Imidazole glycerol phosphate synthase subunit HisH
Amino acid sequence: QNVVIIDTGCANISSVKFAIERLGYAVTISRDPQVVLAADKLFLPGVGTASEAMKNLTERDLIELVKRVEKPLLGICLGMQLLGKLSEEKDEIVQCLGLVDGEVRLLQTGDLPLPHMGWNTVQVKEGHPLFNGIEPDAYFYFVHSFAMPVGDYTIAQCEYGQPFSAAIQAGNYYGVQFHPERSSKAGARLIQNFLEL
């Protein structure tokens, strides 16, 4: 596979790259349209707030490019949230890429601590290939206070105070709310599954 991590220039890239290289794949880091559009598989990382991330995407001339991508793309955590229509702040509503018809909102966890942080299981839509060979009771590592509600785009659900989307898909755009690069063997297999689609 020709693998490209879209160069948002954030701190998560090296850990993502490491996880992919450990699986035997060479990784290219680029924001060049030709290089990106030639890839077989794309990763979209991110950290911080949606406002800063959308600002970063704009300044790096990546808004229109991400929208043009036709091959499978995996957004991780904030990378996933950027695919949706909008995101709250905690304040203004931040307009995101709008590639998935979902919104990102603050989790209402009651007396439960924020962020949703730690190791949790997910409940997968029957037979989705992203989770092939991963047991239902496997743990992924989450660290997020905002989330996308369950909707038509949801391919894995998680429950923490309220149900939310642990993973999503819209055509070639995939997203995970947890960090597979920090989720040990379960996360490694999900990354491998994505690369093997």
